[PDB]
Design a protein around this ligand. Structure first.
Ligand SMILES: NC(=O)[C@H]1CCCN(C(=O)Cc2cc3c(cc2Br)OCO3)C1
Ligand SMILES: [Zn+2]
Length: 139
């Protein structure tokens, strides 16, 4: 679990969005596993606007942060799960690192701010949904 709170927006994994997220929907994209909903309180986070490929993410299954080198946002095949059919997920960045079910929502940050959130995982792999292109989160 986990969310980014920026301005009057909350960014979550689309597959973990609550009834309240859908009732306050701003934007969602099943191909990116992202959903953004509106909030009344002002957020705590700031978003990176950069091309970093290294950073640090939070891994809830280890209660720890780990450094990572990750690929640029791209279209990557993701196997079927209870949440989605087998499909290509866009704007996904892969890295070598620990991940297990329950780790989605963990934040990836670089020196400039929040880069994205954990969205997928494999055997020694972790995938992050990028949010750096969503320029409207800031205004
Ligand atoms: N973005 C999606 O399509 C995700 C929907 C929820 C399911 N999903 C995953 O990847 C789950 C997952 C599977 C794992 C793992 C870590 C994670 Br996270 O390590 C070993 O096998 C895919
Ligand atoms: Zn950066």
């Amino acid at each position: 679990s986990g969310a980014i709170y920026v301005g009057n927006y909350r960014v979550v994994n689309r597959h973990l969005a609550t009834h309240n997220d859908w009732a306050n929907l701003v934007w969602e994209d099943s191909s990116r596993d992202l959903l953004v909903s509106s909030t009344t309180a002002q957020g705590c986070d700031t978003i990176a606007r950069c091309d970093c490929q290294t950073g640090v993410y939070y891994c809830s299954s280890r209660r720890k942060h780990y450094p990572v080198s990750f690929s640029k946002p791209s279209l990557i095949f993701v196997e079927a799960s209870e949440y989605y059919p087998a499909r290509y997920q866009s704007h996904l960045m892969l890295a070598v690192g620990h991940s297990e079910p329950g780790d989605c929502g963990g934040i990836l940050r670089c020196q400039h701010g929040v880069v994205g959130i954990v969205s997928t995982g494999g055997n020694g792999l972790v995938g992050f949904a990028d949010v750096r292109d969503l320029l409207w989160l800031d205004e």
